[PDB]
Each structure stands twice: as structure tokens, then as C-alpha cells.
Design a protein around this motif. Structure first.
Motif, PDB file in Angstrom:
ATOM      1  N   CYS A 178       0.786  -1.234   0.000  1.00  0.00           N
ATOM      2  CA  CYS A 178       0.000   0.000   0.000  1.00  0.00           C
ATOM      3  C   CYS A 178       0.813   1.277   0.000  1.00  0.00           C
ATOM      4  CB  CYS A 178      -0.956  -0.015   1.187  1.00  0.00           C
ATOM      5  SG  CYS A 178      -2.305  -1.188   0.939  1.00  0.00           S
ATOM      6  N   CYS A 179       2.057   1.173   0.453  1.00  0.00           N
ATOM      7  CA  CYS A 179       2.954   2.338   0.482  1.00  0.00           C
ATOM      8  C   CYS A 179       3.901   2.343  -0.726  1.00  0.00           C
ATOM      9  CB  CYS A 179       3.731   2.373   1.800  1.00  0.00           C
ATOM     10  SG  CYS A 179       5.009   3.696   1.908  1.00  0.00           S
ATOM     11  N   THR A 180       4.723   1.298  -0.822  1.00  0.00           N
ATOM     12  CA  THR A 180       5.664   1.099  -1.937  1.00  0.00           C
ATOM     13  C   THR A 180       4.920   0.901  -3.259  1.00  0.00           C
ATOM     14  OG1 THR A 180       7.244   0.046  -0.419  1.00  0.00           O
ATOM     15  CG2 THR A 180       7.737  -0.137  -2.715  1.00  0.00           C
ATOM     16  N   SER A 181       3.784   0.196  -3.258  1.00  0.00           N
ATOM     17  CA  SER A 181       2.913   0.247  -4.456  1.00  0.00           C
ATOM     18  C   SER A 181       1.496   0.709  -4.116  1.00  0.00           C
ATOM     19  CB  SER A 181       2.896  -1.085  -5.218  1.00  0.00           C
ATOM     20  OG  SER A 181       2.722  -2.162  -4.326  1.00  0.00           O
ATOM     21  N   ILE A 182       0.610   0.713  -5.111  1.00  0.00           N
ATOM     22  CA  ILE A 182      -0.744   1.208  -4.882  1.00  0.00           C
ATOM     23  C   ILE A 182      -1.641   0.141  -4.248  1.00  0.00           C
ATOM     24  CG2 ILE A 182      -2.812   2.262  -5.921  1.00  0.00           C
ATOM     25  CD1 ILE A 182      -0.614   3.157  -8.144  1.00  0.00           C
ATOM     26  N   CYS A 183      -2.351   0.592  -3.237  1.00  0.00           N
ATOM     27  CA  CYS A 183      -3.187  -0.206  -2.349  1.00  0.00           C
ATOM     28  C   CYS A 183      -4.568  -0.412  -2.985  1.00  0.00           C
ATOM     29  CB  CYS A 183      -3.323   0.678  -1.128  1.00  0.00           C
ATOM     30  SG  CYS A 183      -3.769   0.007   0.366  1.00  0.00           S
ATOM     31  N   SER A 184      -5.435  -1.174  -2.329  1.00  0.00           N
ATOM     32  CA  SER A 184      -6.797  -1.345  -2.806  1.00  0.00           C
ATOM     33  C   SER A 184      -7.656  -1.577  -1.573  1.00  0.00           C
ATOM     34  CB  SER A 184      -6.852  -2.573  -3.733  1.00  0.00           C
ATOM     35  OG  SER A 184      -6.333  -3.720  -3.072  1.00  0.00           O
ATOM     36  N   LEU A 185      -8.958  -1.384  -1.683  1.00  0.00           N
ATOM     37  CA  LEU A 185      -9.861  -1.668  -0.573  1.00  0.00           C
ATOM     38  C   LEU A 185      -9.784  -3.127  -0.165  1.00  0.00           C
ATOM     39  CD1 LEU A 185     -12.077  -0.647   1.356  1.00  0.00           C
ATOM     40  CD2 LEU A 185     -13.671  -0.980  -0.495  1.00  0.00           C
ATOM     41  N   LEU A 238      -6.741  -3.413   1.980  1.00  0.00           N
ATOM     42  CA  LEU A 238      -6.902  -2.771   3.290  1.00  0.00           C
ATOM     43  C   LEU A 238      -7.779  -3.602   4.229  1.00  0.00           C
ATOM     44  CD1 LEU A 238      -7.320   0.940   2.300  1.00  0.00           C
ATOM     45  CD2 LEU A 238      -5.430  -0.076   3.624  1.00  0.00           C
ATOM     46  N   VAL A 266      -8.861   5.163  -1.408  1.00  0.00           N
ATOM     47  CA  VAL A 266      -7.911   4.135  -0.956  1.00  0.00           C
ATOM     48  C   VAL A 266      -7.016   3.589  -2.081  1.00  0.00           C
ATOM     49  CG1 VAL A 266      -9.498   3.570   0.977  1.00  0.00           C
ATOM     50  CG2 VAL A 266      -9.430   2.115  -1.076  1.00  0.00           C
ATOM     51  N   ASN A 267      -7.230   4.096  -3.287  1.00  0.00           N
ATOM     52  CA  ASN A 267      -6.498   3.606  -4.445  1.00  0.00           C
ATOM     53  C   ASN A 267      -5.316   4.526  -4.846  1.00  0.00           C
ATOM     54  OD1 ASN A 267      -9.755   2.823  -4.795  1.00  0.00           O
ATOM     55  ND2 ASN A 267      -8.369   1.081  -5.170  1.00  0.00           N
ATOM     56  N   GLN A 268      -4.321   4.624  -3.951  1.00  0.00           N
ATOM     57  CA  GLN A 268      -3.108   5.496  -4.116  1.00  0.00           C
ATOM     58  C   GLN A 268      -1.977   5.014  -3.196  1.00  0.00           C
ATOM     59  OE1 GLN A 268      -4.402   9.436  -3.213  1.00  0.00           O
ATOM     60  NE2 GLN A 268      -5.649   8.783  -1.451  1.00  0.00           N
ATOM     61  N   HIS A 269      -0.826   5.704  -3.166  1.00  0.00           N
ATOM     62  CA  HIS A 269       0.266   5.329  -2.239  1.00  0.00           C
ATOM     63  C   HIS A 269      -0.073   5.858  -0.853  1.00  0.00           C
ATOM     64  CE1 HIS A 269       3.200   3.836  -5.207  1.00  0.00           C
ATOM     65  NE2 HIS A 269       2.699   4.773  -5.994  1.00  0.00           N
ATOM     66  N   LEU A 270      -0.204   4.963   0.109  1.00  0.00           N
ATOM     67  CA  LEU A 270      -0.527   5.352   1.489  1.00  0.00           C
ATOM     68  C   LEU A 270       0.625   4.952   2.388  1.00  0.00           C
ATOM     69  CD1 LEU A 270      -4.278   4.284   1.407  1.00  0.00           C
ATOM     70  CD2 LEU A 270      -3.328   6.554   1.302  1.00  0.00           C
TER      71      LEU A 270
END
Lengths: 21, 30
Positions: A6-13, A16, B2-6
Motif C-alpha cells: 500500500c505504500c511502496t505500491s498502490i493499495c486497494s480496498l 486494506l 484508498v487507491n493510491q500510495h498510502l
């Protein structure tokens, strides 16, 4: 884990929600 | 939202919003 996903690449619901109790 | 770098507090805050009253676990090294 969550940082790579989620940090180094793009996250998803989908991803999460894997960390909710 | 939620669809981004977090990262850091931004990730923690997304988990707080999404998981709501279930709560969550944040394990940055697992």
C-alpha cells in the motif's frame, strides 16, 4: 506486508480490509 | 480514496476509516 502493498505500491480496498479485525 | 500510495500516518488513517468499529492491526515489518 502492508507497507510493500500500500505504500511502496498502490493499495486497494480489497487489501486494506485484509487488516481489519 | 484508498487507491493510491498510502504511507505512515496516511495509511494508518485509511485503515481507521475503512475498518471502523472492527479496528485493525498495523504491522509495518510483517
Amino acid at each position: 506486508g502492508i507497507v510493500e502493498q500500500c505504500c511502496t505500491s498502490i493499495c486497494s480496498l480489497y487489501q486494506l480490509e485484509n487488516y481489519c479485525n | 480514496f484508498v487507491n493510491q500510495h498510502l504511507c505512515g500516518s496516511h495509511l494508518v488513517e485509511a485503515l481507521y476509516l475503512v475498518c471502523g468499529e472492527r479496528g485493525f492491526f498495523y504491522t509495518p515489518k510483517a
